[PDB]
């Protein structure tokens, strides 16, 4: 579904093809066959550009379209607090938040 242009953001009519072809390539197939093939899922997207272009809107929209959990977020340099060790404890906290769920519910 590509009402994105009319969803509320103009953007471009070319990105979505690449984005969701890669996403489908990654996550559509059943876990067992993907494991057997031993291919690695895509984990990581880079966005950049001048402000005021709707990057946050694009992020929310893409997060909503995919059937995933409510998106969790963090600040830009607040991660670098005036302390040595916070940059470890807080980051480990953020990752452990989902690690606990993965352990509980399993693979």
């Amino acid at each position: 579904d590509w009402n994105f242009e009319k969803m509320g953001i103009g953007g471009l009519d070319k990105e979505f093809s690449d984005i969701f072809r890669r996403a489908f390539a990654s996550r559509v197939f059943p876990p067992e066959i993907v494991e057997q093939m031993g291919c690695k899922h895509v984990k990581g997207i880079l966005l950049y550009g001048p402000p005021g272009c709707g990057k946050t809107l694009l992020a929310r929209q893409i997060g909503k379209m995919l059937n995933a959990r409510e998106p969790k977020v963090v600040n830009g340099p607040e991660i670098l607090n005036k302390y040595v060790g916070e940059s470890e404890a807080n980051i480990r906290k953020l990752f452990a938040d989902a690690e606990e769920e993965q352990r509980r519910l399993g693979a």
């Binding site: 302390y83 060790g85 916070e86």
Partner: peptide, 24 residues
């Protein structure tokens, strides 16, 4: 160091409680 100060805060709370039990 943050965990240390947090543990010491817990310790001071416990100390208050115990001195709040021994006095009465």
């Amino acid at each position: 160091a943050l965990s240390e100060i947090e543990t010491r805060h817990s310790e001071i709370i416990k100390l208050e409680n115990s001195i709040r039990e021994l006095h009465d």
